[PDB]
Amino acid sequence: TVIAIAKDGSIVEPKLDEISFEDYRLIWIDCYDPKDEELYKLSKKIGISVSDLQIGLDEQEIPRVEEDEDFYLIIYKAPLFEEDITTTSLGIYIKNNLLLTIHSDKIKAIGRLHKLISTKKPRIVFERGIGFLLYHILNEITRSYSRILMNLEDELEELEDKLLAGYDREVMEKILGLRKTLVYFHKSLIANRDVLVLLKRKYLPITTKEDRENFEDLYYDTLQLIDMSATYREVLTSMMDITLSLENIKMNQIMKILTMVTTIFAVPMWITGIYGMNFSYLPLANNPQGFWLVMALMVVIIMIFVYIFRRSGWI
Amino acid sequence: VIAIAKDGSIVEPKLDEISFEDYRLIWIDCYDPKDEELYKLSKKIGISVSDLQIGLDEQEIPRVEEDEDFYLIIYKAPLFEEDITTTSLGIYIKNNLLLTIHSDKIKAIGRLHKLISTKKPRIVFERGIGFLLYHILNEITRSYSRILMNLEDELEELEDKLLAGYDREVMEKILGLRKTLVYFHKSLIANRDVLVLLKRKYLPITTKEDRENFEDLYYDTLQLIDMSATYREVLTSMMDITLSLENIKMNQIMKILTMVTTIFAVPMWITGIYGMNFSYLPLANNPQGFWLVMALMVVIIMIFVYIFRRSGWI
Amino acid sequence: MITVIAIAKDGSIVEPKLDEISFEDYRLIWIDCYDPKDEELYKLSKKIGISVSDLQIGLDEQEIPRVEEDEDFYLIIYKAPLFEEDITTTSLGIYIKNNLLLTIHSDKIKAIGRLHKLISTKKPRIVFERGIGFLLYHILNEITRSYSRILMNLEDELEELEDKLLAGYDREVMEKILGLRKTLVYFHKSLIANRDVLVLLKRKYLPITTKEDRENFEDLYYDTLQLIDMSATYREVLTSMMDITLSLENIKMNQIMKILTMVTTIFAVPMWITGIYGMNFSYLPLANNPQGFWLVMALMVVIIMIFVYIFRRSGWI
Amino acid sequence: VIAIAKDGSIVEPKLDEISFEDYRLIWIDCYDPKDEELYKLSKKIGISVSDLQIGLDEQEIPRVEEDEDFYLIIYKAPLFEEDITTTSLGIYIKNNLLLTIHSDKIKAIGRLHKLISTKKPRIVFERGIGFLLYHILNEITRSYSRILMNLEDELEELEDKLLAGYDREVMEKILGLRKTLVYFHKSLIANRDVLVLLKRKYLPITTKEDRENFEDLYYDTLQLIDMSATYREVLTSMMDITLSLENIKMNQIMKILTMVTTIFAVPMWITGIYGMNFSYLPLANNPQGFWLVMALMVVIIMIFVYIFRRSGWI
Amino acid sequence: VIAIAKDGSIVEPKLDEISFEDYRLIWIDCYDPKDEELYKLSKKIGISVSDLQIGLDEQEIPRVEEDEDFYLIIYKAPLFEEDITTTSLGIYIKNNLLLTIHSDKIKAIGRLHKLISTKKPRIVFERGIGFLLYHILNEITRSYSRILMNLEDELEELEDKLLAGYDREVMEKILGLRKTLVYFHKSLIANRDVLVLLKRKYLPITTKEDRENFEDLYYDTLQLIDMSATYREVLTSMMDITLSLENIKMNQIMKILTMVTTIFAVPMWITGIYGMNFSYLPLANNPQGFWLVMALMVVIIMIFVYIFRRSGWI
C-alpha cells in the first residue's frame, strides 16, 4: 500500500509491497509523509507502535541513537533546499532484518539510493547486511551536505567581488543570511557527528566490525563537513569586517572634504568679517581700489590653501 | 525540605526514615535540610554531619572522593528560577545507600522521583547502585540539554530585534545569555571530567555495564559543551555585528554635515563680500543688484545640491 | 606540456610505452587519460572494461576525494592543484583494477606531467619492483609535491606584498592578498579531504596495497598534515596583513579631525568679535576711535596666537 | 631561609642534621637556602650543590629529568607577592629522599607542612615517595584551582562596570587578569605535560597506584588549563565591548554638531543677505520688515528642529 | 671552532683526530668551516663535500633522511645576534659517528661542549647513539624555550606603553616582534614533524627508549608551538587595542569641535541679526543697547558652558 512506501530485499533484487518477511535476507522499507492509514498499516505490519513510528515523523527531533527492546532507533538530519530555506529531517528503525526509513519530508539521498538500485533491478548485489545498508543511507545523506556546501561556495564566489566596493545593504544582508544558514547546518553536522561516533564506537547487534569501521570513515567525512562549515563562517565574518573597514575609510575622505571647505574659507571669511566692521577708518575703505584689492588678497589666499591641499595630497 | 526513600529486598517499598532496612539498595533524597533533621540523617546513615555539609556548598566543585566508608561525588546541575539560570549539587554513596543532598532544588532529581514512582507500582530495577547513580546523572544531563534548546530558541529570538541597531536592552539580554552560557560551560566541563572518571577508573560501585553507561553520558556531555560553545560564538557574533553596524550611521551623519557646510559656503562668502564697508561695491547702487547677486548665490547652491544628488550622497 | 589523451606502461621484464592494443603479458600498466571526447572515452572504456559512467565519475573535476570499493575495481578521487592563469584551484581521479592503474582527469595534472617526463630518464636507468599500490603512492606523492611548491612560492610572495602593504591601503594589492587567501581556503578544503583519503589508504587492509605500501602512505599522511598547517599559517598571515593596513587607514581621521577642529577653534572667537563689531548700533565702543580698528584687529590676532599656542603646545600642531 | 624534615618508621618525627637509614621516606624542604645552608644540605643529602642550584632557579621550566642516582622534577606553582600573580619551583628524589627546594615561597608546600603538624589523625603514609610527589603536585594544582574562583568573582564584578563606559582602571584590571592567565597558560600547559610523563612512563620512583594518581591529576590540570583559557576569552570580549561601546558615542556627538550646524544655516544665510549693502534691500524700509524676517528665520529653525525630532534623531 | 671529538672508551676523553676506533660513539661539531677546512674534514670523515654543503645551508628545511651508510637530520636552532633571529644546522650520523655542523653559532651545542668538559662531564652512555641524538635535539629545544622568555620581557616592556594610545615606534616594534614570532613558528613546526618521525617509526638507529624520549621531546615542542601562537595573538591584541584607544580620542576631539560650534551659534545669530540693514533694528538707538545685547550673548555663552559642564563634557 504505497504512500509512498518503496520496498527492497533478498537474493535477486526484487521490489515488492506489503507481505512475507521471509525468506528475504534483508528488507529496506521506506515510508514518506504517510497518512495515518498508511502509518497504522505499516505499524501493524512491523510491530512498532504508531507513536514510536511518529517519533520518526516529528521532524525537528534531535539526531541520536536509542535501544528499545526489539528495535534500534536512529535519528539523523538530512539537508533540504527550498529557495534559501535550508534545513534538516529523518528517522530510521532497524529490528531483525528490517531497516525502516520513515520521513515527513523529502530525502534526496533516499531517492539517490533508489535510483542506484534502479540500475538493472536484478543486479547490484549485497553480502554486507543491515549495518552496511545503514552505512550507505547515512553516507549519501553526508554527500548531500557536501553538494550543498559547494553551493554555499558559489554564493561566496558571487559576493566576493562585490566586497571591496565598500558597503551595500543588499550584499551584507546576503552575507548575514549565509552566516545564519551556515550555523544551522553546523549544529546539524555536530548532532550527526555524534550519532556516528556512537555507531563506530559501540558494539551493537546491528553492526559488524567492518560496518563499525565504515562508520568511522563516515565520521572523518562528517568532520571535514564541520571543518569547512566553520571555515566559511570565519570567511563570511571577515567579509563583513572588510566592508565595515571600507565604510570607516569613506568616513575619512569625507572629513577631508569638510575640513578642506572649512579650512579654505576661514581666513577669507575673517577678511570679510573685518571689512564689515563699523569702524571709521577701515584702512582702504575710502580707497577706490579697496574692494578689488581685498577681493584679490582673498582669492590669493584661497588659491594658496588649494595648493597646499593639492600637495600634500588631499584634493 | 524533606528526605525520601526507595527499594527493599523484594521490590521498591517507600519512605520512612528510621526503618529497619535489610533493603536491596536505598535511594534517599534530601533538600535544604534543617540542622535537626540533618543530624537525624547523619545518625541514620553513619556519615558525619560535617561530611554531609559539603554537599550543601552550592559553589563547591564537581569531583570524586574515595574516602573510607563512603564515596563522594559532587556534580553540577542546572537551576532555573525565573530568568536567572545557574548550577548546584552533591552525592554520597556507601553499600546499598545512595544519598542526594542539595541546598537548591534539582528539578532533574525530582523528575527521577516522579518517574520511578508513578503509583503504583512500576519500573523494575535490576542493575544496582552504579545504575541509580547513572540515572541521576543522565536526567541531570538531559536538563542542561532542554534548557539549552531554550537558550537556542531565545537566541534566535534576538536575531531580528538585533537588526534594528544598537539597543541597550537587546544588549544586556545578550550579555546575560553569555553570562549564563559561560557558567554552563564551566560546570559542563567539570561534570565531563567526572564522567571521564566513572567511565575510566575501575570501582566497587560500578559494573562494566555501568561504566559503558557513564561513557555514553560522557559523549553526551561533550555534545552539550560543543553546543554551549557554539551559542557563545553566535552571541559574540550578534554583539559585534550590531555594535559595528552603528558606524555606518556615524558615517551618513558626516555626509549631512559636510553637505550643509559645503552647500552654503560660497553663498556665505558672497554675502560676506557684499557686506563689506567700501565706498565702492560693484553693483551696490544698481537697483537690480541685490537680485543679481541673490541669483548668483541661488545658482551656486542649486549647482552644489546637483553635485551632491548625483555621485552619490543624497 | 605536451599532453596526450591516452598513455601506457610496464611489463614482464622492463617498461616500454605501448600499442593501444596489448593485455595479460604486462606486469602492471599505467594508462593516463586526459579530457577525452565521449567517443574517445567509449574506446577507452571498451578496452579497460570499466564502464562509461563509472569513468565519467573520474572525469568530473568537482568530484570529492574518497575511496570506493565497487567490486571489479578500486576508485580513488584525489585533489590536485590547478594553475590555469594564476587562479590556483584543484581536481582529479584514479581507477585500479587488476594490474591496471588508470589516471583519468578532465584537467591538467602537473604531477602526472612530471612523472611522465621523468620516465624519459629510464636511460640511464630505473627499476620498479613494487607493484600497483606503490605507483599509486607515486602519483599521490607527486601531487603533494605540487602543493608544497605552490606553497613555497607563496611564502616567497608574501614577503613581497609585505612592503607594498606599508605604502598605505591599495585596492590592487588588497585584491592580490584576498586572492591568495581564497586559494588557501581551496587548498584547505582539498588538502583536508586528500589527507583523510591517505588515512584510509594507510589504515585499511586493501588488496591493492601492502604493509610496505601502507607504510608509504603513512609518511604521505604526515606530509599532507604539514601542508595543511603551513597553509593555515599563510592565511593567518594574510588576514593579519589586511587587518593591519585597514586599521592603519582608520587612524587618519585623527589628523583630519584635528585640522578641522583647529581651524574652527582658532577662528571662532575672532569671528564673534568681528560680528559684534559689525552690529550697527548708534554707539559702538571704540568705533569712533581713529586707532580703534587697529586696537580690535590686534585683540583678534592676539586671541589667535594664544589659541595657536594652546594647540602647538599640548600636542596637535 | 629554612629547611624542613620528616617521617621515621611507624610515624613522622622532625629531624636535626642528620639521620637517614631507618626512615621509610624523608621530605626535606629548602626555602631560599643560603650558600652555607646549600653546602651543608648538598653534602648532607648527596646530590651536587650546583645541581641543587637549579631547583633554586625560579625561571627553570617544568620537566622530568633522570640523572644518575636520582630524579629531578621541576614544577610551576602560582606565586602572589602583591596582586601580580606568577609561577616557580623544583624537586629531587633519590632512594627515600624527596627534596622540595624553592626560591619563592610556595603556598601549597607551606600548606602540606602546616597540615601535617596536626598529627591527631592516624596519620600514616603507606604509599611511598611516589605518593608524596603526587600529594605535593596535587596541592600546587589545587592552588591554581582556587585562584580561578578568585577570578570568577573579580570577573563577575567587572561585568558590571563593562557597559558603564571605557575606564582606564577597568582597563588595566582586565589587562592584568589577562597577563596573569597567560602565565597560568605557559605554566599550566607545561605542568600538564609533566603529569603526562609521570602518568605514562614506568619509573622506579612511582608505583602504579601512584601513576593512576598522577593521571587524575593530569585531567584536573586539563580543566585548569581549559578554564583559564575561557576566562581569557571573557576578559577579551570585555575589552571589546567597552572599547567598541565608547566608539559609538561619536555618533551622538556628530549628531549634535551636525544638528546645530544644520539648524542655523538657512537663518545665518538670511541674516547674511539682509546685511548686504546694497541700497534697495527689499523690505529694508518696512518698519515691520525686521520682525517680518525674524519671524521667517525663527520658523525655519522650528522646521529643522522638527525635522530632527520627527526623523530619528535628536 | 671547527672540530671537537668526544668519548673514546668509558669516560669522556675530548679527543684527537685520526683513530676513530675502540670507542662507543664519537661526536664532532664543526663550526663555519672555511672551504679548505671543510675540505680537510670532508675527506677525513667521508661525507661528500656536497653532502656537507647540505648541513651548511642555513636556509634548508628539516627532515629525516635514510641514505645508505648514512643518516641525515636537519634541525632548526635559534639565534640571537641583536634582535634578529633565524634557523640552521644539519646533523650527519653514519655507523657510530655523529657529526654536527653549522654556519652560525649554536649556543645549544656550545652549552653541550661546555657541559661535557667540566672536569669529567660525567655521567655515561649505555644508551647508544640515539640517546645522544635526543640530548642534542632536546638541548636545542630548551634554547628555544629560553628565547620565548626574551620575547616575554619585550612584551612586559610594551604592556605599559599600551594604554597611552598610538606610538609609531611602539607599533612598528610590535609588528616586528609578530613577524619574528611567525618565522619562529614555521621553524618549530618543521622541527616538530622531524620529532614525529623519530618518535613514530622504528629506525635501527634508535631504541624503543630512544623513540619514547623523542616523544617527550615532541610534546615539549608542541608546548612551544602553543606558546608561539598564544603570544602572536597577544601581539595582535596589543595593536588592536592601541588602535581602539585612538578611535576613542577621536571622540574627545569631535566633542571639542561640537562644544565650540555650539558655544557660539546663538551668539553669532545674534550678531547676525544686529548687523542687518533694516532701518528699524529693535534696541539699536538705545545707548544702553550695545551692552544690553552683549550681556545677552555673554549670558547665552555661559549658559551653554554650564549646560556642557553637566552632564559633563567639560
Ligand SMILES: CCCCCCCCCCCO[C@@H]1O[C@H](CO)[C@@H](O[C@H]2O[C@H](CO)[C@@H](O)[C@H](O)[C@H]2O)[C@H](O)[C@H]1O
Ligand atoms: C554541511 C556544511 C555546509 C553546508 C551548508 C552551508 C550553508 C549555505 C547553503 C548553501 C548555498 O546557499 C543556498 O543556495 C541557494 C540557491 O541554490 C540560495 O538561494 C537564494 O538565497 C537568497 C534568498 O532569495 C538570495 O539572496 C540568493 O541570491 C539566492 O540564490 C540561498 O541563498 C542558499 O540557501
Ligand SMILES: CCCCCCCCCCCO[C@@H]1O[C@H](CO)[C@@H](O[C@H]2O[C@H](CO)[C@@H](O)[C@H](O)[C@H]2O)[C@H](O)[C@H]1O
Ligand atoms: C551684466 C549686467 C549689468 C552690469 C552692470 C554694469 C557693469 C558691471 C559692474 C561694473 C564694475 O566696475 C569695476 O570697477 C573697476 C573700475 O572702476 C574695475 O577694476 C579693475 O581696474 C582696476 C585698475 O585701476 C584694478 O585694480 C582692478 O583689479 C580691476 O578689477 C573693474 O574692471 C570694473 O569692472
Ligand SMILES: CCCCCCCCCCCO[C@@H]1O[C@H](CO)[C@@H](O[C@H]2O[C@H](CO)[C@@H](O)[C@H](O)[C@H]2O)[C@H](O)[C@H]1O
Ligand atoms: C587684513 C587686514 C588689512 C588691514 C591693513 C591695510 C593696510 C594699510 C595701508 C594703507 C596706508 O598706510 C597706513 O597708514 C597708517 C597710519 O595711521 C599705518 O598705521 C600704523 O601706524 C599707526 C600708529 O598710530 C598704528 O595705529 C597702526 O597699527 C600702524 O599699522 C599703517 O601701518 C599704514 O599701512
Ligand SMILES: CCCCCCCCCCCO[C@@H]1O[C@H](CO)[C@@H](O[C@H]2O[C@H](CO)[C@@H](O)[C@H](O)[C@H]2O)[C@H](O)[C@H]1O
Ligand atoms: C529670505 C530670503 C529671500 C528674501 C529676501 C528678499 C526680499 C524681497 C521679497 C519679498 C516679497 O515681495 C516683495 O516684498 C514686499 C512684501 O512684503 C512688497 O512690498 C510691500 O511690503 C509691505 C507688505 O508686506 C508693504 O508695507 C509695502 O508697502 C509693500 O511695498 C513688494 O511689493 C514685493 O515685491
Ligand SMILES: CCCCCCCCCCCO[C@@H]1O[C@H](CO)[C@@H](O[C@H]2O[C@H](CO)[C@@H](O)[C@H](O)[C@H]2O)[C@H](O)[C@H]1O
Ligand atoms: C535679539 C532678538 C530681537 C530683540 C527684541 C528686543 C525687544 C525690545 C523691547 C522694546 C519694544 O520695542 C517695540 O517692539 C515692537 C514689537 O512688536 C516693535 O513693533 C511694533 O511697532 C511697529 C511699528 O509701529 C509695528 O509695526 C508692530 O506691529 C509692533 O509690534 C516696535 O517697532 C518696537 O519699537
Ligand SMILES: [Mg+2]
Ligand atoms: Mg516500547
Ligand SMILES: [Mg+2]
Ligand atoms: Mg535489542
Ligand SMILES: [Mg+2]
Ligand atoms: Mg530483541
Ligand SMILES: [Mg+2]
Ligand atoms: Mg530485535
Ligand SMILES: [Mg+2]
Ligand atoms: Mg535489533
Ligand SMILES: [Mg+2]
Ligand atoms: Mg555509490
Ligand SMILES: [Mg+2]
Ligand atoms: Mg572498512
Ligand SMILES: [Mg+2]
Ligand atoms: Mg554692515
Ligand SMILES: [Mg+2]
Ligand atoms: Mg561645519
Ligand SMILES: [Mg+2]
Ligand atoms: Mg559653518
Ligand SMILES: [Mg+2]
Ligand atoms: Mg563508480
